[PDB]
Design an enzyme around this catalytic site. Structure first.
Site, PDB file in Angstrom:
ATOM      1  N   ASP A  41       0.840  -1.155   0.000  1.00  0.00           N
ATOM      2  CA  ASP A  41       0.000   0.000   0.000  1.00  0.00           C
ATOM      3  C   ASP A  41       0.899   1.235   0.000  1.00  0.00           C
ATOM      4  O   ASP A  41       2.124   1.120  -0.030  1.00  0.00           O
ATOM      5  CB  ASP A  41      -0.975  -0.037   1.195  1.00  0.00           C
ATOM      6  CG  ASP A  41      -0.395   0.536   2.460  1.00  0.00           C
ATOM      7  OD1 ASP A  41       0.842   0.434   2.682  1.00  0.00           O
ATOM      8  OD2 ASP A  41      -1.213   1.101   3.239  1.00  0.00           O
ATOM      9  N   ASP A  93       1.214   5.149   1.965  1.00  0.00           N
ATOM     10  CA  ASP A  93       0.742   5.953   3.086  1.00  0.00           C
ATOM     11  C   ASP A  93       1.165   7.413   2.951  1.00  0.00           C
ATOM     12  O   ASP A  93       2.329   7.703   2.676  1.00  0.00           O
ATOM     13  CB  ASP A  93       1.315   5.427   4.398  1.00  0.00           C
ATOM     14  CG  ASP A  93       0.990   3.979   4.629  1.00  0.00           C
ATOM     15  OD1 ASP A  93      -0.178   3.572   4.542  1.00  0.00           O
ATOM     16  OD2 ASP A  93       1.936   3.203   4.821  1.00  0.00           O
ATOM     17  N   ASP A 115      -3.517   4.822   2.349  1.00  0.00           N
ATOM     18  CA  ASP A 115      -3.974   5.404   3.600  1.00  0.00           C
ATOM     19  C   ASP A 115      -3.621   6.869   3.628  1.00  0.00           C
ATOM     20  O   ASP A 115      -2.492   7.251   3.320  1.00  0.00           O
ATOM     21  CB  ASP A 115      -3.331   4.723   4.787  1.00  0.00           C
ATOM     22  CG  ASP A 115      -3.750   3.274   4.922  1.00  0.00           C
ATOM     23  OD1 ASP A 115      -4.879   2.937   4.522  1.00  0.00           O
ATOM     24  OD2 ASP A 115      -2.951   2.479   5.450  1.00  0.00           O
TER      25      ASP A 115
END
Ligand SMILES: [Mg+2]
Ligand SMILES: [Mg+2]
Ligand code: NA
Length: 326
Positions: free
Chosen positions: A193, A195, A250
DNA sequence: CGGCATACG
DNA sequence: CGTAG
DNA sequence: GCCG
């Protein structure tokens, strides 16, 4: 070798990869059976090996290393002697481990949900898809996008994502800044992912920012999934040649007063942060989180202007992000 | 033996 | 319950 | 599972 991971540099790449990996399988398995203590020890033992300056070649080189007792030492011994540890291989092969790994990998499914599904007799992703009424909205998104989310993101992808986030943030609040955190800030070339940490130099201006950012990204057609407020766990549409892929992103907002704490926490690693918080409380009597550092005797918060400040206030040698890969 | 990090959605 | 590091 |  210091006992806490926050007291020693841990680089991203090291000299004991095979050994550390084997121990991490046992850690993961312990987590799947709710044994957080055993997970922690196996993680800590693995991390000690990542911190060593050269390969472990003989059993005697473990003597005096913290977190190596009878069990972890035996695992290393068998790997050194035979190239394989029977316990580790039994875990790898087990139906329980493979299925718990598969299910916990789904965004929206934790250990507790995975375990219940396992006990109900479910084994495959298509078993879950056949009974979609039982899934949360989050789990439905996680299952729909599972294939894309299983594919790592490259650093070039991250730079593209940062630009689109910066555009949205600039409209939401002129002067707000976007900082890349997570594994990419620790030097990872790939990751699962991305961030971002968002703040504004004038304290208070960041209040209510995240909804404004999310609404703008939604209108741009970039958001495949989100929950809707200072953390947003999203699935983004990332451009690819002739198409696109789903990517976990995120977004986190913090006031500039808290920015160094948030940056520290969101940069990780996970084990590094747990160890830092453990060190803070147990060795210094100070309470650390991603918002601040509290002295419970004076009843005061430490003002930090930088990560460097935080390490100094804990009496730790500064470690840059690329040495926090515990 | 107790403890194992500490939050937000 | 899930999520994050 | 290991440390203090
Ligand atoms: Mg990350
Ligand atoms: Mg993340
Ligand atoms: Na999951």
């Amino acid at each position: 070798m210091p006992a806490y991971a926050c007291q020693r540099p841990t680089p991203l790449t090291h000299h004991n990869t095979g050994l550390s990996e084997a121990l991490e399988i046992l850690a993961e398995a312990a987590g799947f059976e709710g044994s957080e203590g055993r997970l922690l020890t196996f993680c800590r033992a693995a991390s000690v090996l990542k911190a060593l300056p050269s390969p472990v070649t003989t059993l005697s080189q473990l003597q005096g290393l913290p977190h190596f007792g009878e069990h972890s030492s035996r695992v290393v011994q068998e790997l050194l002697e035979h190239g394989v540890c029977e316990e580790v291989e039994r875990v790898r092969r087990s139906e329980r481990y493979q299925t718990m790994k598969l299910f916990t990998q789904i965004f929206g499914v934790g250990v507790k949900t995975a375990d219940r599904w396992y006990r109900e007799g479910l084994r495959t992703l298509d078993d879950l898809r056949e009974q979609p009424q039982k899934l949360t909205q989050q789990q439905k998104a996680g299952l729909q996008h599972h294939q894309d989310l299983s594919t790592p993101v490259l650093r070039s992808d991250v730079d593209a994502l940062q630009q689109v986030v910066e555009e949205a943030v600039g409209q939401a609040l002129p002067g707000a800044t976007v900082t890349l955190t997570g594994g990419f800030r620790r030097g990872k070339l790939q990751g699962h992912d991305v961030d971002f940490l968002i703040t504004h130099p004038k304290e208070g201006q960041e209040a209510g920012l995240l909804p404004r950012v999310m609404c703008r990204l939604q209108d741009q057609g970039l958001i495949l999934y989100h929950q809707h407020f200072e953390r947003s766990f999203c699935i983004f549409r990332l451009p690819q040649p002739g198409s696109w892929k789903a990517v976990r992103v995120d977004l986190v907002v913090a006031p500039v007063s808290q920015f160094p704490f948030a940056l520290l926490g969101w940069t990780g690693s996970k084990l590094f942060q747990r160890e830092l918080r453990r060190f803070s409380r147990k060795e210094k009597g100070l309470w650390l989180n991603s918002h601040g550092l509290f002295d419970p005797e004076q009843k005061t918060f430490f003002q930090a202007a930088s990560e460097e400040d935080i390490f100094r206030h804990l009496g730790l040698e500064y470690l840059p992000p690329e040495q926090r890969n515990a």
